[PDB]
Ligand binder design. Structure first.
Ligand SMILES: CCCCCCCCCCCCO[C@@H]1O[C@H](CO)[C@@H](O[C@H]2O[C@H](CO)[C@@H](O)[C@H](O)[C@H]2O)[C@H](O)[C@H]1O
Ligand SMILES: CCCCCCCCCCCCO[C@@H]1O[C@H](CO)[C@@H](O[C@H]2O[C@H](CO)[C@@H](O)[C@H](O)[C@H]2O)[C@H](O)[C@H]1O
Ligand SMILES: CN(C)c1ccc(O)c2c1C[C@H]1C[C@H]3[C@H](N(C)C)C(O)=C(C(N)=O)C(=O)[C@@]3(O)C(O)=C1C2=O
Lengths: 156, 1033, 48
């Protein structure tokens, strides 16, 4: 835990852009993580702060940092439907097929919440459409279980 | 009437004696307390849902109860919070004047009918309805010093052997245990369970079966076979009573005939019901009792009763156990009552000194000595009649009123003395003539003083309740004072005073007094010469008066406004706050460090630190804590350096560098019952379907905008908690159904093990107590423990929790708030220096109007009181003004002459403002009470001047200046005596340090500042006022 | 129903009695707990 590391976790969470800017100039650990293993990139992704995601990525943030249950920022961004953040992470090397401890992927999470554009973006970056979670489920299973016809059509 | 009693001194004695006996009786029967009821009645509903997160509590308990709070009368507003300690509190606040008993029973009856809608385990725990706007009389700490008892051990002892006897102690209305009685604690082991294909479900089932009360019936019960010889009750299964028995509960018979017992899969022990709070007292395990005074009780008698009871319990204490008193409001009542006595004693002495110094005979000296005590005693009798208590505020009014009774007493006797010396009339004839000169004005003065003080009783809510205490004490005192002036003191004067030869002004005596007399006689001529030359040039004095009036305006405006001044109440608090997710152990290290500081760096000021881990005021949880710091007496803490403000500021400084924690000392509110009463209290409301996240965004938006106006708003902040990481686990229904695992088993396994479960009751040495199952700590700490729990499937196979669930981190609220039934967020802040809170409120309303669609707001608490209180003030001040004028117009038979008296108001008010400003004080209720008494006194001096001046023109045909000069000459001595007596008598309030000195200093420096300028200015200005007013009309 | 007197006193009467402190004008309180499991607690108040 860093002095500035903690300050950065908070600023990124709060989306205080100007503060994050200053913190970057000062060398605040971009790889700082809280108790559950979340980085500022994790936090920015969760709460959907796009500029901070971009600033963190310019400053050497681990794009594929996983938390203590193995979830990545792409998981969070996909899950909470932040399309532009999803795109940015992918452009910066996010593992499109990252599995968390449950074998859950970003495609699973996006399909489960009915995020069609994000599902499309993920498929475009090579999301494995046949990937199965710990229960053998695919994003497609989720779609028809949820009764989402549009989504199902997308995944064939 | 004066004439009536001058001829009937015995009849006047009889009235005085009746008044004294009525006063004496009242003192016996009068409730004694630190404060009257001041806060509006508030009822609180408390529920607890073991192992529940905040959203669970809100959505299965809080919303249901809130939706049933209808048809209840005089409700102002309702507010609630639900948090992740499994707790909800709903507070309903009622209009001032509501019967608190009716309010409570109406709330509890609506609740009673919502119970069937609540979850089972919440019904099991019960839901309490209580009056919460009541405060603690004292707190009794119970500690163990020899390391033999845990705080659980102590709490159980107190509940079993102290609480009830204290509850029954005379005068106590309520007792609260700081902890719980023992519970039977079953600490499950998931490895041992799985080993035998058992689960918490089996553990709960076995316990409900083998720890129970079972009805049977009777032998030879009715209706019987005729000829039956005995009738006897059958006793069957009764509840378990020991850990040994619980350990021996049967869970399973193995195939080899071997037996699985509860002690084979769990650790059994007596322990707490909850483990959220860790209480220490100077580092040692602690418990205690919060005690409240019963209605109409005597706080001093109750305190002594409580200590007497504790003493007779002491012989039976186990070793190491010690009673300790970290909070006792009872000193303040004692100090207050003593002040009333000390003030009465000092006034009698001062009046003796001043009467003798000027009148130089012991007889005149006696009359006030008699009259003042009589009036004061009768004042208690009226307080009683009106249902007031002897309390800090009423007693403080008594001290002020004593100053007023002294004034009346002196004025009546002085005038008889002057009339004797000037006319040579015998005591009786002179008393008649003297009373004839002042009696009308005395009644007018009584009317005018009432008009000033009474309207303040009509401020609403809290503010009125505080002013009421003063205005009823003060207005009663001077109504009785005038009454004694028209009945007793004339009788006393006519019978007790020695004759004075006409022309005898004592200039012939030798020694100090002969000198003083010649000097004061010369001074009176120099004075009248001055006034003569002043009245030769009234133009410049009108100018000087507009200057004073202007300066008053300026001083008044720039004086900072506060409601009540802080006090050094002998105790203060230290907030401790650790980041989200911070654990109980970490908080304890900070508390320890904090406790180590006070016992070290404040060893000369600090008696004890009561560290409460797991408790905060704006949110409970493992990462918040409070240290209650108790001090030695104000006597052992000499000077400003060792008073609470100094100590706290030093403490907050020293704690600033504590690493990962927010730690700061701060003072109690002046009246704990009333709450903070500083700045504003603002509610942001989800008026549509926005939800928690969208309301947080709107909150943040408003907080950022508040921060852009540091010029008008300072410290605008949430009163609640921020979202924190939480661990979301999804049960997969399909996989459970496919494995033959029921959801009820899964969910009961998870919640019983990780959240703990209240199974049923047992009896421990004759007291009924709870039974809880829960996992031993080390099997419910981390996410990887989740997979160590197993559930038995229909087919008998044991299935690890990991087989049918998945988990992820997310954020959520550890404390959801609601206001008037809607999601809400409470925001506190204050006006920046130089600005009024009302102005700060208006901006908040303006920023609020720019928030996203569907976000509303409301004002509550102090801000609610502030608003409706602020809308009266103008109407009340005008009514006062009008009535004063009408009384004066009646008194003088004139629409214009009242103006010459009313003009004196700035003359005293300017002094008050000057003294306050210089001494750095503020305009608060005690200052305002001081402004009123300052106005009244200067009003009184002016009234008698104008009365004499006018009477001389009317009765003796004297010219305007002639009459004015003569009046002012005649009133010089009484004004000086009367002002000297009062300045000296109010001195101790000004220099007072210690108990209640904040309040004392406020009225003291105001009333003394005001008395200096009022008497110096009035003796020159009211002659001017009277002349110019007369001329103009 | 079914409780002996000592049981109902321990689980019922004492529980209620210990909450009957601090009621206005309470002169005295008496109760009984019997073998039919029924308890009666009577609170008597100042004459007016
Ligand atoms: C020596 C004898 C002493 C006698 C002193 C008697 C004083 C008694 C005065 C009490 C009168 C009621 O007191 C006051 O009445 C007025 C008129 O309805 C109320 O109503 C007031 O409220 C609104 C608030 O928006 C004002 O804008 C409005 O001008 C005014 O009517 C006040 O809210 C109430 O506090
Ligand atoms: C108990 C408090 C004791 C306070 C003692 C402190 C002294 C306070 C003095 C108050 C002022 C009185 O001072 C009084 O001023 C007026 C001026 O208006 C003087 O009056 C003199 O000058 C004015 C013009 O300047 C003339 O019109 C007037 O005819 C002339 O005699 C008086 O001679 C003087 O006595
Ligand atoms: C807040 N306060 C004055 C104190 C101070 C010292 C303490 O030692 C304690 C408290 C609060 C009390 C409240 C009580 C309550 N009750 C009277 C049984 C209670 O319902 C709970 C609870 N969390 O459910 C407690 O924490 C509690 O058991 C507890 O352990 C406390 C406790 O230990």
């Amino acid at each position: 835990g860093s002095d500035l590391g903690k300050k950065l976790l908070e600023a990124a969470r709060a989306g205080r852009d100007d503060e994050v800017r200053i913190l970057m100039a000062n060398g605040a650990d971009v790889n700082a993580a809280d108790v559950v293993g979340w980085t500022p990139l994790h936090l920015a992704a969760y709460w959907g702060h796009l500029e901070i995601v971009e600033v963190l990525l310019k400053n050497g943030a681990d794009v594929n940092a996983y938390d203590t249950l193995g979830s990545t920022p792409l998981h969070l961004a996909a899950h909470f439907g932040h399309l532009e953040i999803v795109e940015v992470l992918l452009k910066n090397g996010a593992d499109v097929n990252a599995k968390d401890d449950n074998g859950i992927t970003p495609l699973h999470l996006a399909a489960n919440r009915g995020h069609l554009e994000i599902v499309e973006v993920l498929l475009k970056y090579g999301a494995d459409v046949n990937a199965q979670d710990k229960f053998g489920k695919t994003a497609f299973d989720i779609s028809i279980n949820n009764g989402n016809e549009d989504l199902a059509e997308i995944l064939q | 009437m004066p004439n009536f009693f001058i001829d009937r001194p015995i009849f006047a004695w009889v009235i005085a004696i009746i008044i004294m006996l009525a006063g004496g009786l009242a003192i016996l029967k009068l409730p004694v307390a630190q404060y009257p009821t001041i806060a509006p009645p508030a009822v609180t509903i408390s529920a607890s849902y073991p192992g529940a997160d905040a959203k669970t509590v809100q959505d299965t308990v809080t919303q249901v109860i809130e939706q049933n709070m209808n048809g209840i009368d005089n409700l102002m507003y309702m507010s609630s919070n639900s948090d992740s300690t499994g707790t909800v509190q709903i507070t309903l606040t009622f209009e001032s004047g509501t019967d608190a008993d009716i309010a409570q029973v109406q709330v509890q009856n609506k609740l009673q009918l919502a119970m069937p809608l609540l979850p089972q385990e919440v019904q099991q725990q019960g839901v309490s309805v209580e009056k919460s706007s009541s405060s603690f009389l004292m707190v009794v700490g119970v500690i163990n010093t020899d390391g033999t008892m845990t705080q659980e051990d102590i709490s159980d002892y107190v509940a079993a052997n102290m609480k009830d006897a204290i509850s029954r102690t005379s005068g106590v209305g309520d007792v609260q245990l700081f902890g719980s009685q023992y519970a039977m604690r079953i600490w499950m082991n998931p490895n041992e369970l799985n080993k035998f294909q058992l689960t918490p479900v089996d553990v709960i089932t076995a316990i409900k079966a083998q720890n129970a009360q079972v009805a049977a019936g009777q032998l030879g019960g009715t209706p019987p076979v005729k000829g039956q010889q005995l009738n006897a009750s059958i006793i069957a299964q009764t509840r378990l009573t020991s850990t040994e028995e619980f350990g021996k509960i049967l869970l399973k018979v193995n195939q080899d005939g071997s037996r699985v017992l509860l002690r084979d899969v769990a650790k059994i022990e007596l322990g707490g019901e909850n483990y959220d709070i860790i209480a220490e007292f100077n580092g040692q395990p602690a418990s205690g009792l919060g005690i409240k005074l019963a209605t109409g009780a005597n706080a001093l008698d109750t305190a002594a009763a409580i200590r007497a009871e504790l003493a007779k319990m002491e012989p039976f204490f186990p070793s190491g156990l010690k009673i300790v008193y970290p909070y006792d409001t009872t000193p303040f009542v004692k100090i207050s009552i003593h002040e009333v006595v000390k003030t009465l004693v000092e006034a009698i002495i001062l009046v003796f000194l001043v009467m003798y110094l000027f009148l130089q005979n012991f007889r005149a000296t006696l009359i006030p000595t008699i009259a003042v005590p009589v009036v004061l005693l009768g004042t208690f009798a009226v307080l009683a009649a009106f249902g007031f208590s002897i309390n800090t505020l009423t007693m403080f009014g008594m001290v002020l009123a004593i100053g007023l009774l002294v004034n009346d007493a002196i004025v009546v006797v002085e005038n008889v003395e002057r009339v004797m010396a000037e006319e040579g009339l015998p005591p009786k004839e002179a008393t008649r003539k003297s009373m004839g000169q002042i009696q009308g004005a005395l009644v007018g003065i009584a009317m005018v003083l009432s008009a000033v003080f009474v309207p303040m009783a009509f401020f609403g809510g809290s503010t009125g309740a505080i002013y009421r205490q003063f205005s009823i004490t003060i207005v009663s005192a001077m109504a009785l004072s005038v009454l004694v002036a028209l009945i007793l003191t004339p009788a006393l004067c006519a019978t007790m005073l020695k004759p004075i030869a006409k022309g005898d002004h004592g200039e012939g005596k030798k020694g100090f007094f002969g000198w003083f007399n010649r000097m004061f006689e010369k001074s009176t001529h120099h004075y009248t010469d001055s006034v003569g030359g002043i009245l030769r040039s009234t133009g410049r004095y009108l100018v000087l008066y507009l200057i004073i009036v202007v300066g008053m305006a300026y001083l008044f405006v720039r004086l900072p406004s506060s409601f009540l001044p802080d006090e050094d109440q002998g105790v203060f608090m230290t907030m401790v706050q650790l980041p989200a997710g911070a654990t109980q152990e970490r908080t304890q290290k900070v508390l320890n460090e904090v406790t180590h500081y006070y016992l070290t760096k404040e060893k000369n000021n600090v008696e004890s630190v009561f560290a409460v881990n797991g408790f905060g005021f704006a949110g409970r949880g493992q990462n918040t804590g409070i240290a209650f710091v108790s001090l030695k007496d104000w006597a052992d803490r000499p000077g400003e350096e060792n008073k609470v403000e100094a100590i706290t500021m030093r403490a907050t400084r020293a704690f600033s560098q504590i690493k990962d924690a927010m730690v700061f000392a701060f003072n109690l509110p002046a009246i704990v019952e009333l709450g903070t009463a500083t700045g504003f209290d603002f509610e942001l409301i989800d008026q549509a379907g926005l939800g928690h996240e969208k309301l947080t965004q709107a909150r943040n938006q408003l907080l950022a905008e508040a921060a852009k106006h540091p010029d008008m708003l300072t410290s605008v902040r949430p009163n609640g908690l921020e979202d924190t990481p939480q661990f979301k686990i999804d049960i997969d229904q399909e996989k459970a159904q496919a494995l033959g695992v029921s959801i009820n088993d899964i969910n009961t396994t998870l919640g019983a093990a990780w959240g703990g479960s209240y199974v049923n009751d047992f009896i421990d040495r004759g007291r009924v107590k709870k039974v809880y199952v829960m996992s031993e700590a080390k099997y419910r700490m981390l996410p990887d423990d989740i997979g160590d729990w197993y559930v038995r499937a229909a087919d008998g196979q044991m299935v690890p929790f990991s087989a049918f669930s998945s988990s992820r981190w997310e954020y959520g609220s550890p404390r959801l708030e609601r206001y008037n039934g809607l999601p809400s967020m409470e925001i506190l802040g204050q006006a920046a220096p130089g600005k009024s809170t009302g102005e700060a409120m208006e901006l908040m309303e303006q920023l609020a109007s720019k928030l996203p669609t569907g976000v509303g707001y409301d004002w509550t608490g102090m801000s609610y009181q502030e608003r409706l209180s602020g809308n009266q003030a103008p109407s009340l001040y005008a009514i006062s003004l009008i009535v004063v004028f009408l009384c004066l117009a009646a008194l003088y038979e004139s629409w214009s002459i009242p103006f010459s008296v009313m003009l004196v108001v700035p003359l005293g008010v300017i002094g008050a403002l000057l003294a306050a400003t210089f001494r750095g004080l503020t305009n608060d209720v005690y200052f305002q009470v001081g402004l009123l008494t300052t106005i009244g006194l200067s009003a009184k001096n002016a009234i008698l001047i104008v009365e004499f001046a006018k009477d001389l023109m009317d009765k003796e045909g004297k010219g305007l200046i002639e009459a004015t000069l003569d009046a002012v000459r005649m009133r010089l001595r009484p004004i000086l005596m009367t002002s000297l007596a009062f300045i000296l008598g109010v001195m101790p309030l000004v220099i007072s340090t210690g108990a209640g000195s904040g309040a004392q200093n406020a009225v003291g420096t105001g009333v003394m500042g005001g008395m200096v300028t009022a008497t110096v200015l009035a003796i020159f200005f009211v002659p001017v006022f009277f002349v110019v007013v007369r001329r103009r009309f």
